Design a protein around this ligand. Structure first.
Ligand code: CLA
Ligand code: CLA
Ligand code: CLA
Ligand code: CLA
Ligand code: CLA
Ligand code: CLA
Ligand code: CLA
Ligand SMILES: CCCCCCCCCCCCCCCC(=O)OC[C@H](COP(=O)(O)OC[C@@H](O)CO)OC(=O)CCCCCCCCCCCCCCC
Ligand SMILES: CC1=C(/C=C/C(C)=C/C=C/C(C)=C/C=C/C=C(C)/C=C/C=C(C)/C=C/C2=C(C)CCCC2(C)C)C(C)(C)CCC1
Ligand SMILES: CC1=C(/C=C/C(C)=C/C=C/C(C)=C/C=C/C=C(C)/C=C/C=C(C)/C=C/C2=C(C)CCCC2(C)C)C(C)(C)CCC1
Ligand SMILES: CC1=C(C/C=C(\C)CCC[C@H](C)CCC[C@H](C)CCCC(C)C)C(=O)c2ccccc2C1=O
Ligand code: SF4
Ligand code: SF4
Lengths: 160, 148, 74, 739, 80, 61, 130
C-alpha cells in the first residue's frame, strides 16, 4: 500500500516472528516444573506476546519486509492513531505544563521575594495554577489577543 | 533506518550551525563581554571575573564547532558506508533491521567490519592490511593525545 | 565519498569562522546603516537572539527526539 | 554538667529545614542566580566554613559518621532481606557448583521480565556477583529465616545509629577534649573494635561456622543440620566433628594449646571440597589477630601512668637530614580533620586494593573461587574503591595544606622541609614518570610496529628479546618452598598462585600457579608508570597548594578556585583541586589498566576447566602470553574478542548489560562537552535563551547562569568516571557471566 | 607588556589597586566622582595579565580594562 | 528624576540595558555619573546597583 | 651561617631565584620588624624574622609583593621593594612616592585614563592598517 508496505495481518514474516518468539518462550518454559511461579510468569509472557501480536495485526498497521509495524506519519487521517492523535495528546499535555509554569512564574514574580518562591514552592498557589491549565489553548488565545503574552522592548539586548 | 539517520544528520547540521552562527553574531560582544570586538577574533578569555569567561571568544566557537562538524561528518560517513557495505555484500536486510537502534550500529557496522582490519597483523602473521591496523592504532593514540 | 564529505565539513566550518572574523575586524555598522535604519546585514545583529534561540530550539528538538526514538528501539 | 559532653547544645527543630543554605554565611541570604543552588550542595558537608570552632566541626563530623553508619546498616539489612525473600539461596546451598546466585527478581513491566535469568534452582532473577551467598555459607547461615532475622537486626541497628547521631548532636554532644584523646581513641579502636571484633568472630566461627560448614562439606543437607544454638548447648554435636571440645576450656587455661589443633589449624592452601580457605585456618587467624590487636591496644597513655605519649614519640624522632623531625606533627593531626582524613583515606584505599588482591589470590569463602563473576566483580570493585579513596586522601592532604597548615607551628619540621625542596621531588618524579612511560609504553609500541612490519623476532616477547621478571619468579619460588623450610608448621603454600597443584572444584579451576613471563613484566611496569604519574599529579597538587613561582600567594585563593587569570601566559587549573581532578583522570586510567590485566590474565592463564585426565583448558586459551604484548593485541584479542558477549546480549537475559554498555558510552561522551568547552560560550547561549524567555514573559526570577568553571570541571570528571567505569562494568559482567 | 586602561566610570573605590599582585595600579586625585580619586596604570611594564584588577571592579561594565599584548619575562611571570 | 523614580537604562554596555531600575540618589555635585540606580536582577559580578549619567537614564511614565 | 646578618633566619629552599636573577634582574624587599616573628616564604617554607633590619631577595616583583602583603598581617608597613639589574642598579619600586598606591597622594598624574566609558571605544574596522 502506502510506500510499498503491506498490512501486518497479511505479512507472513510477522507471523514468523510471532511463532519464533512463542517457540523460544515455550522452550524456556520446558525447563521449569509444574505450576511453579516461573512457569506462571513464562505463560503470562506467552499470553502477552500473543495479545500484542494480535492487536498489532488488527490495528491498520503497515509492515515492511522485516515484519515490523511501520508508522505512516505523512499526515493522512487513515493512519491517524500512529502519530496525529498522540501528537495532539502531547501538545495538550506539554502546553498544560508550560502554561502552568509560566503562570506560576508570572504570579510569584509580583511578590516581595520572587526568588524565594522558586526554591520553596507556594504549594497552595501552585495547585491553584496547575489545575487551571486545562484551558491553556483558550487562555493562550485570550492573552495573545490582549497583548499580555509577548514583551516588546523591555527585553535586554547585547551591545551589537 | 534512513529516516532516523537523516534526522540525526539534521541534528548535527543544526547544532554545528548553532555554534558557528552564535560565535559569528556574538563575535562583536554579548552581555558577558559587551566589548568583545576590542579583544579581536581569537583571545584566551576575559578572566575568572563575572562568574568565569572560559571559551568566550569567537575563535572558541569555531573550536567547539569543529567537534560537532567531525561528529556530523562521522554520522554521515557511517551511514553511507554501512548502507553501501550492506548493498555490496547483498545483506541489505541487515541494515534495514539493525539500523533502527544504536546497538545495531555498534555491533553490525563497527564490531562486525572491524575484524578484517584488526587482523592486519597478529601473533601469527600479517597481511597487506597491516598498515591500516597500524594507522588505526595511530589514530586512536593521536585522538587520546588530543584528549590530553 | 568520505574524503569529499570531510573536506565539505572543513570548508563549511571555515566559511562560518571567516564570517565571524569579518564581524570582528571588518564589519562597520556605519556603512550598513542609513539614518538609523539598518540594512539587510546589520539587521542580523538585531534579532541575533531570536536566531540563536530558534537554532537552539531546533537542535534540542531534534536531539531529544532522535535520541528518544533510538533509545526506545534499543 | 559532664566534663566530656555538652547537654542540649542544638534544639531539635524543623525551622532550619525550611531555610536552605542556613549553614553558610553567603548562601543564607537566599538564591539570586542558579549558581546558589549548586553552591548549596557543594558546601553542605564543608563544615570548616560553616563554623569557626573546631568543636562544632568535630560534633558535626561525629553525627555525620553516625548517619553514614546508619545508611550502611540499612544497605546491609536490604541485602539480607533480599537474600531471605527474593533469592534462591536455599537452592544454591544444595547445589553450589551448578546454581548461579541470584537475589533480585525483576517485576514484569514494559517487557523487562527478560532480565529474570535462568539462574537455576527453579528460580528466575538477576545473577548476583557480590558473593553474598558464599559469605552467608561461610557464616553457617543455612536457612532464609536467619537471613530475615539478620535483616531485622540490620534495620534495628540502622535506627540505633540514626538515634545515636541525633543524640550526639542535639542532646549530648562531646567536647573538643574528648575528640582530641587520640591516645584513648587509638587504644579503643585497636583493642576493643579490632581485637574484640576478631575475637568475637573467632568465637562465632569456632562455635557455629566450623561445625555447620564441616557438616555441609560432608554432604549433610541443610535441613538435617542442627540449628546453630544447639552447637553451643550441646558439647556433643561439635565434639564429633572436632574431637577436642570434649576437654572443654581446660587446655586453654592450662596453656596446653596443642589440644586445640583439631579446629585451630595452620594448613594453607584451599579446601579441596569447596575451593576456599580452611575455616579452621580462618578461625585460628582471627584468634591470633584478636590477641595481637588487643595487645597493641595497650600502647598509648590515656588515664594512668602507663603507656606512650604520641607527642613524646614523634618529637624524639629527629635526624641529621630531617632537622626538627616529627616535632609538631602531633599538633597537626590533633587540630586538623583534613590531615587525618588524608592519612586515613590513603591507607584505606591501599588497604582496599590489598584486600582485592588477597581475595582472589586466596579465596576465603566456600565455592567462591569457581564463581568467576563474583571473583572478577569483587576484585574490580575493591580496586576501584581503593583508587577513589587514595585520590580522596591526596585531595584532603591538599585541603589541609591550603586551610589548616600553620607555617609558624611547623618551623623546620618534616612538613616544612618537604615544601622547601618540593622542586627536587617533583622534578625527579617527573623524570621517573617519563622514564617509566617511555619504557613500558614504547616497548609496547615497539612490539606493535615490529609485528606490523613482519619482524616477529624483534619483539619484546618470550620467543624474542625476553624480559623475564626474575625477581618476582624468585619470590614465587620462595613461597612454594616455604612449607617445611621457612614455615615448617605449614602443610601447603599460602596461595597456589605462587606454585603447586591445580585446585579444581567440580571440574572448574579454583586456583592455579600464575606464571609470570615477559607479558607480565610489561604490564607490571605499565602499572608502576601509571601509579607514578598519578602520584606525580597528586603530590604536585599537595606541595604547590600554598604557593609557587607562578602564584606566590596561591594559598590566599583557597583550595578550590578555577585560576588566577589569563596572565602569566595562562594560569588555568593551578589549584590543588584541579590536581585532584587530573589525578582522578589518571587514577581511572591506572585502575582500568589494572582490572584489564587482571581480567585477561585470569581468563587466559588461571580460570577454565580441568579434564578428568588432568588437561587444563582455559577460558580464552593462553593468548595472554603472546598477544598481550602489543596494543593491537589488547584491542583485538581482549577488547574486541571479549566484547562479543556484550554486543550479542540483546534479546537475552543479559540485555541490560548491553543497554548499560551503550548508556555508559553515552555518558562518557557526554562528559567531553563539559571537559572540552568553557563557561563563556554557555553563558552567552543562555543569554539568547533568556532573551526568548523574556520575550515570552517566562524568564525565571532566579537568574540562570552557566555552571562555574570548577563545577564544569567537576561535572566533566564525574561523567567521565561514571561512563568509563560503567562501560567496563557492563563489559566485565556480561563477558564473565556468559562464559 | 599588556595594556591597562582606566575609564571615567571609576568610582574610586580602590578595590582594583589593592588587588593588583604586581603594583601596577595606583590611586590618583580626580574630580569626576564623589571619592575624588581615580585609578591609574603607570607601571604596566609589571602587569602580568591576571585580571584580578577587574575582578574587584564594582562598576557596571568595569572601569579598569586589561588588554593582553606582547609578552615579556615580567608579564609571563617567569621566575627563571 | 529623583530618589525613588523609575528609569530605563540607555547605556549599551550594561547588564540592565533596556531594563527598568529604581533611582537611589541623584548627586547634585559636578560628578560625571550622578544617578545611582538599584536593580532587582544582579549582574554577572553579583552587584545590583550602578552609577549612571543623566543622559543614560530615561524616566518611566 | 648566612651571608648577611639582616637575612631572615631561613634554611634555604630550592624555590628561590635562578640564573635569571643573576643576569636579567633581581628584587630585594627590606623591612624592620619589632619581633622575630615566624613567617612563610613566598618561595618555600617558614622563615624567622630578625628583631630589626630584614632583607630578602627574590626573582619576581610579585614574590616580594606577596611577602609584603603577608607582612601587613604582622602590623609591618615600612616594607620597601627594590629592583636590582645585573649590576648594582637599585630602583625603588613599591612605595614609589612613599605612600602606598591604595592611598591618594598629591603629585600623581593619571596614566591610561580614557574620558569615556567602554561603549565609547572606536570600532575595530576603523583601526585597520595603522
Ligand atoms: C516550565 C516553564 C517553562 C516554559 C514555559 C518554557 C518555555 C520555553 N523554553 Mg524553557 N526551560 C525551562 C522551563 C520552561 N521553558 C526550564 C526549567 C529549563 C531548564 C532545563 C529550560 C531550558 C530551556 C532551554 C535550554 C531552551 C528553552 C527554550 C524554550 C522555548 C521553546 C520551548 C522549548 O524548547 O522547551 C524547552 C524545554 C525544556 C528544555 C525542558 C523544560 C524542563 C521542564 C519540563 C520544565 C520545568 C517545569 C516546571 C518545574 C513546572 C513548575 C511549575 C509549577 C510550580 C506550577 C520556550 C519559550 C528554548 C528556546 O529558547 O527556544 C526559543 C531553549 O533553547 N528552555
Ligand atoms: C582557502 C581557504 C582559507 C584561507 C585562505 C584561510 C586564510 C586564513 N585563515 Mg582560515 N580556515 C579555513 C580556510 C581558509 N583560511 C578553514 C577551512 C577553516 C576551518 C578549519 C579555517 C579556520 C580558521 C581559524 C579558526 C582562523 C583562521 C585564520 C586565518 C588567517 C590566518 C591563517 C593563519 O595564521 O594560518 C596559520 C596556520 C597554521 C597554524 C597551520 C595549521 C596546520 C594544521 C594544524 C594542519 C597541519 C597538520 C598536518 C595535517 C599534519 C598531518 C599529521 C600526520 C601524522 C598525518 C588567514 C586569513 C586565523 C585568523 O586570525 O584569521 C584572521 C584564525 O584564527 N582560519
Ligand atoms: C554524546 C555526547 C554529547 C551529547 C549527548 C551532547 C548533547 C548536546 N550538545 Mg554537545 N558536545 C559534545 C558532546 C555531546 N553533546 C562534545 C564532546 C562537544 C565538544 C566540546 C560538544 C559541544 C557542544 C556545543 C558547543 C553545543 C552543544 C550542544 C548540545 C545540545 C544540542 C541539542 C540537543 O541535542 O538536545 C538534546 C539533548 C540530548 C539528546 C542530550 C541530553 C538528553 C538526556 C539524555 C536527557 C536525560 C534526562 C534524564 C545537547 C544538550 C549545543 C546546545 O547547547 O544547544 C542548545 C551547543 O551549542 N554541544
Ligand atoms: C537499601 C538498600 C535497598 C535497595 C537498593 C532495595 C531495592 C529494591 N527493593 Mg528493597 N528493601 C530494603 C532495602 C533495599 N531495597 C530493606 C531494608 C527492606 C526491608 C524493609 C526491603 C524490602 C523490600 C520488599 C518487601 C520489596 C523490595 C523490593 C525492591 C525492588 C523494587 C523497589 C521499588 O520499586 O520500590 C519503589 C519504592 C517507592 C516508589 C517508594 C518511594 C528494588 C530492587 C520489591 C521487589 O523486589 O519486588 C519484587 C519488594 O517487593 N524491598
Ligand atoms: C571499645 C570501645 C570502642 C568501640 C568498639 C568503638 C567503635 C567505633 N568507633 Mg569509637 N571511640 C571510643 C571507643 C570505641 N569506639 C572512645 C573511647 C572514643 C573517645 C576517644 C571514641 C571516639 C570515636 C570517634 C570520634 C569516632 C568513633 C568511631 C567509631 C566507629 C568506627 C567506624 C567503624 O569501624 O565501623 C564499625 C562499625 C561497627 C562494628 C558497628 C557496631 C558498633 C557499635 C555502634 C558499638 C559501638 C561501641 C560504643 C562505643 C558503645 C557505647 C554505647 C553507649 C550506650 C555508651 C566504630 C563503631 C567513628 C564513627 O563512625 O562514629 C560513629 C568516629 O567518628 N569513635
Ligand atoms: C571518607 C571520605 C570522604 C569524606 C568525608 C569527604 C569529605 C569532604 N570532601 Mg572529599 N573526596 C573523597 C572522599 C571524601 N570526602 C574522595 C574519595 C575524593 C576523590 C574523588 C574526594 C574529592 C574531593 C574534592 C575534589 C573536594 C572534596 C571536598 C570535600 C568537603 C566538602 C564535601 C561536600 O560538600 O560535598 C557534598 C557532596 C556532594 C557535592 C555530592 C556530589 C555527588 C557526587 C560527586 C556524584 C556521586 C555519583 C554517585 C556515585 C551515583 C552515580 C550513579 C548514577 C547512575 C546516577 C568535605 C570535607 C571539597 C572541599 O571543598 O573540601 C574542603 C572539594 O573541593 N573532596
Ligand atoms: C594516549 C594519550 C596520552 C598519552 C600518550 C599521554 C602521555 C603522557 N602523559 Mg598524559 N593525559 C592524557 C592522555 C595521554 N597522556 C589525558 C587524556 C589527560 C587528561 C586528564 C592527561 C593528563 C596528564 C597529566 C595531568 C600528566 C600527564 C603526564 C603524561 C606523561 C607521562 C610521562 C611519560 O610517559 O612520557 C613519555 C611519553 C610517552 C609514553 C608517550 C609516547 C612516547 C613514545 C612511546 C616514546 C618516544 C617516541 C619517539 C620520541 C618518537 C620520535 C619520532 C617522532 C619525532 C616522529 C606522558 C607524556 C604527566 C607528565 O607531565 O609527565 C611526567 C602529568 O603530570 N598526562
Ligand atoms: C631512602 C632514603 C632514606 O629514607 O634515608 C633516611 C634519611 C635519614 O634522614 P634522618 O636521619 O634525618 O631521619 C630521622 C628522622 O627524621 C626519622 O624520620 O632520610 C633522608 O635523608 C631523606 C632523603 C630522601 C632521598 C630520596 C632518595
Ligand atoms: C529542491 C529542488 C530545487 C531547489 C533547490 C534549492 C532552491 C536549493 C537551495 C539551496 C540553498 C539556498 C542553500 C543555501 C545554503 C546556504 C549556506 C550554506 C550558507 C552559509 C552561510 C554562511 C557560511 C555565512 C557566512 C557569513 C557569515 C557567518 C556572516 C558574515 C558574512 C558571511 C557570508 C561570510 C530545484 C528547483 C533547483 C530542482 C530540484 C528540487
Ligand atoms: C551479622 C550482622 C549483624 C549481627 C551481628 C552480631 C549478631 C554480632 C554478635 C556479636 C557478639 C555476640 C559478640 C560477642 C562478644 C563477646 C566477647 C567479645 C566476650 C569477651 C570476653 C572476654 C574478653 C573475657 C575475658 C576474660 C575475662 C575478662 C575474665 C575471665 C578470663 C577471660 C580471659 C575469659 C547485624 C544484625 C548487627 C547487622 C548485619 C550484620
Ligand atoms: C553544557 C554546559 C554548561 C551548561 C549546563 C547547565 C546550565 C546545566 C543544566 C542542568 C539542568 C538545569 C539540571 C539537570 C537536569 C538533568 C536532566 C538531571 C540529571 C539527570 C539525573 C538522572 C541525575 C555549563 O555551564 C558549562 C560550564 C563550564 C564548562 C562546560 C559547560 C557545559 O558544557
Ligand atoms: S577562564 Fe579558563 S582560561 Fe581564562 S583564566 Fe580562568 S581558567 Fe584560565
Ligand atoms: S593584571 Fe590586572 S591585576 Fe594583574 S597587574 Fe595588571 S592590572 Fe593589576
Amino acid at each position: 500500500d502506502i510506500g510499498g508496505l503491506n498490512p501486518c495481518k497479511d505479512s507472513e514474516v510477522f507471523q514468523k516472528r510471532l511463532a519464533k518468539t512463542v517457540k523460544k518462550l515455550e522452550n524456556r518454559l520446558k525447563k521449569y516444573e509444574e505450576g511453579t511461579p516461573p512457569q506462571i510468569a513464562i505463560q503470562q509472557q506467552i499470553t502477552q506476546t500473543k495479545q500484542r501480536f494480535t492487536r498489532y495485526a488488527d490495528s491498520n498497521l503497515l509492515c515492511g519486509n522485516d515484519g515490523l509495524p511501520h508508522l505512516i506519519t505523512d499526515g493522512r487521517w487513515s493512519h491517524g492513531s500512529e502519530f496525529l492523535l498522540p501528537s495532539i495528546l502531547f501538545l495538550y499535555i506539554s502546553g498544560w505544563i508550560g502554561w502552568v509554569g509560566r503562570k506560576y512564574i508570572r504570579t510569584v514574580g509580583q511578590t516581595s521575594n520572587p526568588t524565594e518562591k522558586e526554591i520553596i514552592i507556594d504549594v497552595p498557589l501552585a495547585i491553584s495554577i496547575m489545575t487551571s491549565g486545562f484551558l491553556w489553548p483558550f487562555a493562550a488565545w485570550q492573552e495573545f489577543l490582549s497583548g499580555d503574552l509577548i514583551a516588546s522592548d523591555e527585553t535586554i539586548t547585547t551591545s551589537p | 533506518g534512513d529516516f532516523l539517520v537523516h534526522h540525526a544528520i539534521a541534528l548535527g547540521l543544526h547544532t554545528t550551525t548553532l555554534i558557528l552562527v552564535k560565535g559569528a553574531l556574538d563575535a562583536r560582544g554579548s552581555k558577558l563581554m559587551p566589548d568583545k570586538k576590542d579583544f579581536g577574533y581569537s583571545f584566551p578569555c576575559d578572566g575568572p571575573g563575572r562568574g568565569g569567561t572560559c571559551d568566550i571568544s569567537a575563535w572558541d566557537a569555531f573550536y567547539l564547532a569543529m567537534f560537532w562538524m567531525l561528529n556530523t561528518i562521522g554520522w554521515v560517513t557511517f551511514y553511507w558506508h554501512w548502507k553501501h557495505l550492506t548493498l555490496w555484500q547483498g545483506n541489505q536486510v541487515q541494515f534495514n533491521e539493525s539500523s533502527n537502534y544504536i546497538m545495531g550500529w555498534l555491533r553490525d557496522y563497527l564490531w562486525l567490519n572491524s575484524s578484517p582490519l584488526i587482523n592486519g597483523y597478529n601473533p601469527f602473521g600479517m597481511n597487506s592490511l597491516s598498515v591500516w591496523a597500524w594507522m588505526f592504532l595511530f589514530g586512536h593514540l593521536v585522538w587520546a593525545t588530543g584528549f590530553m | 565519498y568520505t574524503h569529499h564529505q570531510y573536506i565539505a565539513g572543513f570548508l563549511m566550518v571555515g566559511a562560518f569562522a571567516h564570517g565571524a572574523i569579518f564581524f570582528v575586524r571588518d564589519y562597520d555598522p556605519a556603512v550598513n546603516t542609513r539614518n538609523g535604519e539598518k540594512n539587510v546585514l546589520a539587521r542580523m545583529l538585531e534579532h541575533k537572539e531570536a536566531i540563536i534561540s530558534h537554532l537552539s530550539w531546533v537542535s534540542l528538538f531534534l536531539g531529544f527526539h532522535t535520541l528518544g526514538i533510538y533509545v526506545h528501539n534499543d | 554538667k559532664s566534663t566530656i559532653v555538652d547537654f542540649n547544645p542544638v534544639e531539635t527543630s524543623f525551622e532550619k529545614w525550611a531555610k536552605p543554605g542556613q549553614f553558610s554565611r553567603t548562601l543564607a541570604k537566599g538564591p539570586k542566580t542558579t549558581t546558589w543552588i549548586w553552591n548549596l550542595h557543594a558546601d553542605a558537608h564543608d563544615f570548616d566554613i560553616q563554623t569557626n570552632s573546631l568543636q562544632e566541626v568535630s560534633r558535626k563530623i561525629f553525627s555525620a559518621h553516625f548517619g553514614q553508619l546508619a545508611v550502611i546498616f540499612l544497605w546491609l539489612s536490604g541485602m539480607h532481606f533480599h537474600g531471605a525473600y527474593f533469592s534462591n539461596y536455599s537452592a544454591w546451598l544444595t547445589n553450589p557448583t551448578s546454581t548461579k546466585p541470584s537475589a533480585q527478581i525483576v517485576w514484569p513491566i514494559v517487557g523487562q521480565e527478560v532480565l529474570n535469568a535462568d539462574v537455576g534452582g527453579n528460580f528466575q532473577g538477576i545473577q548476583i556477583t557480590s558473593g553474598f551467598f558464599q559469605l552467608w555459607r561461610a557464616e553457617g547461615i543455612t536457612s532464609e529465616v536467619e537471613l530475615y532475622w539478620t535483616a531485622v537486626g540490620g534495620l534495628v541497628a540502622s535506627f540505633l545509629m540514626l538515634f545515636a547521631g541525633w543524640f550526639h548532636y542535639h542532646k549530648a554532644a562531646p567536647k573538643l577534649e574528648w575528640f582530641q584523646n587520640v591516645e584513648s581513641m587509638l587504644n579503643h579502636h585497636l583493642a576493643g573494635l579490632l581485637g574484640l571484633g576478631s575475637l568475637s568472630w573467632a568465637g562465632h566461627q569456632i562455635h557455629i561456622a566450623l561445625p555447620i560448614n564441616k557438616l555441609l562439606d560432608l554432604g549433610v543437607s541443610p535441613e538435617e543440620i542442627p540449628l546453630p544454638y544447639e552447637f553451643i548447648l550441646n558439647r556433643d554435636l561439635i565434639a564429633q566433628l572436632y574431637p577436642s571440645f570434649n576437654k572443654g576450656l581446660t587446655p586453654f587455661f592450662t596453656l596446653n594449646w596443642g589440644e586445640y589443633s583439631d579446629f585451630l589449624t595452620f594448613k594453607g592452601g584451599l579446601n579441596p571440597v569447596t575451593g576456599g580457605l580452611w575455616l579452621t585456618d580462618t578461625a585460628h587467624h582471627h584468634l591470633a589477630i584478636a590477641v595481637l590487636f588487643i595487645v597493641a591496644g595497650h600502647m598509648y597513655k590515656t588515664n594512668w601512668f602507663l603507656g606512650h605519649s604520641i607527642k613524646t614519640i614523634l618529637e624524639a624522632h629527629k635526624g641529621p637530614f630531617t632537622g626538627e623531625g616529627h616535632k609538631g606533627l602531633y599538633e597537626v593531626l590533633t587540630t586538623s580533620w583534613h590531615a587525618q582524613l588524608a592519612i586515613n583515606l590513603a591507607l584505606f584505599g591501599s588497604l582496599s586494593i590489598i584486600v582485592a588482591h588477597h581475595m582472589y589470590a586466596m579465596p576465603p569463602y566456600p565455592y567462591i573461587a569457581i564463581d568467576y563473576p563474583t571473583q572478577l566483580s569483587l576484585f574490580t570493585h575493591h580496586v576501584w574503591i581503593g583508587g577513589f579513596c587514595i585520590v580522596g586522601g591526596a585531595a584532603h592532604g591538599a585541603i589541609f595544606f591550603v586551610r589548616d597548615y600553620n607555617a609558624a607551628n611547623n618551623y623546620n619540621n618534616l612538613i616544612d622541609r618537604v615544601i622547601r625542596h618540593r622542586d627536587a621531588i617533583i622534578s625527579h618524579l617527573n623524570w621517573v614518570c617519563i622514564f617509566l612511560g617511555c619504557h613500558s609504553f614504547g616497548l609496547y609500541v615497539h612490539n606493535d610496529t615490529m609485528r606490523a612490519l613482519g619482524r616477529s623476532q624483534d619483539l619484546f616477547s618470550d620467543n624474542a628479546i625476553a624480559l623475564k621478571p626474575i625477581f618476582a619468579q624468585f619470590i614465587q619460588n620462595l613461597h612454594t618452598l616455604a612449607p617445611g623450610s621457612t614455615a615448617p608448621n605449614a602443610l601447603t603454600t599460602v596461595s597456589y598462585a605462587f606454585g603447586g597443584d591445580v585446585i579444581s572444584v567440580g571440574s572448574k579451576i579454583a586456583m592455579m600457579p600464575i606464571s609470570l613471563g615477559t607479558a607480565d613484566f610489561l604490564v607490571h611496569h605499565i602499572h608502576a608508570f601509571t601509579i607514578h604519574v598519578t602520584v606525580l599529579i597528586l603530590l604536585k597538587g599537595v606541595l604547590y597548594s600554598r604557593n609557587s613561582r607562578l602564584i606566590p600567594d596561591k594559598a590566599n585563593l583557597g583550595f578550590r578556585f578555577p585560576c588566577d587569570g589569563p596572565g602569566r601566559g595562562g594560569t588555568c587549573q593551578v589549584s590543588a583541586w584541579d590536581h585532584v581532578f587530573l589525578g582522578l583522570f589518571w587514577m581511572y586510567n591506572s585502575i582500568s589498566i589494572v582490572i584489564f590485566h587482571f581480567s585477561w590474565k585470569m581468563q587466559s592463564d588461571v580460570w577454565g576447566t580441568v579434564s578428568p585426565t588432568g588437561a587444563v583448558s582455559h577460558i580464552t586459551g593462553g593468548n595472554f602470553a603472546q598477544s598481550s604484548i602489543t596494543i593491537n593485541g589488547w584491542l583485538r584479542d581482549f577488547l574486541w574478542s571479549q566484547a562479543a558477549q556484550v554486543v550479542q546480549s540483546y534479546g537475552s537475559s543479559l540485555s541490560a548489560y548491553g543497554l548499560i554498555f551503550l548508556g555508559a558510552h553515552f555518558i562518557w561522551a557526554f562528559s567531553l562537552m563539559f571537559l572540552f568547552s568553557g563557561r563563556g560560550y554557555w553563558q552567552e547561549l543562555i543569554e539568547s535563551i533568556v532573551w526568548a524567555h523574556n520575550k515570552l514573559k517566562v524568564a525565571p526570577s532566579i537568574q540562570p547562569r552557566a555552571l562555574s568553571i570548577t563545577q564544569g570541571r567537576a561535572v566533566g570528571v564525574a561523567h567521565y568516571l561514571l561512563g568509563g567505569i560503567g562501560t567496563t562494568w557492563a563489559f566485565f559482567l556480561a563477558r564473565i557471566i556468559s562464559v | 607588556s599588556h595594556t591597562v586602561k582606566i575609564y571615567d566610570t571609576c568610582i574610586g573605590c580602590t578595590q582594583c589597586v589593592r588587588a593588583c599582585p604586581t603594583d601596577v595600579l595606583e590611586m590618583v586625585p580626580w574630580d569626576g566622582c564623589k571619592a575624588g580619586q581615580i585609578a591609574s596604570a603607570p607601571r604596566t611594564e609589571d602587569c602580568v595579565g591576571c585580571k584580578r584588577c577587574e575582578t574587584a571592579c564594582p562598576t557596571d561594565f568595569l572601569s579598569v580594562r586589561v588588554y593582553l599584548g606582547g609578552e615579556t619575562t615580567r608579564s609571563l611571570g617567569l621566575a627563571y | 528624576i529623583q530618589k525613588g523614580s523609575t528609569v530605563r537604562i540607555l547605556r549599551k554596555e550594561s547588564y540592565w540595558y533596556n531594563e527598568s531600575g529604581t533611582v537611589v540618589v541623584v548627586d547634585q555635585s559636578k560628578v560625571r555619573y550622578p544617578v545611582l540606580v538599584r536593580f532587582t536582577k544582579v549582574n554577572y559580578a553579583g552587584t545590583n546597583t550602578n552609577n549612571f549619567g543623566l543622559n543614560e537614564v530615561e524616566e518611566v511614565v | 651561617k648566612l651571608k648577611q646578618s639582616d637575612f631572615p633566619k631561613f634554611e634555604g629552599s630550592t624555590g628561590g631565584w635562578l640564573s635569571a636573577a643573576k643576569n636579567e634582574e633581581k628584587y630585594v624587599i627590606i623591612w624592620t620588624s619589632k619581633d622575630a616573628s615566624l613567617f612563610e616564604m613566598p618561595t618555600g617554607g617558614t622563615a624567622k624574622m630578625n628583631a630589626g633590619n630584614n632583607v630578602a631577595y627574590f626573582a619576581r616583583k610579585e614574590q616580594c609583593l606577596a611577602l609584603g602583603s603577608q607582612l601587613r598581617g604582622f602590623k609591618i608597613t615600612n616594607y620597601k621593594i627594590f629592583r636590582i639589574y645585573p649590576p648594582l642598579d637599585i630602583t625603588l619600586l613599591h612605595p614609589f612616592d612613599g605612600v602606598f598606591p591604595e592611598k591618594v597622594n598629591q603629585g600623581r598624574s593619571p596614566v591610561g585614563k580614557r574620558d569615556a566609558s567602554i561603549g565609547g571605544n572606536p570600532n575595530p574596522a576603523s583601526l585597520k592598517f595603522q
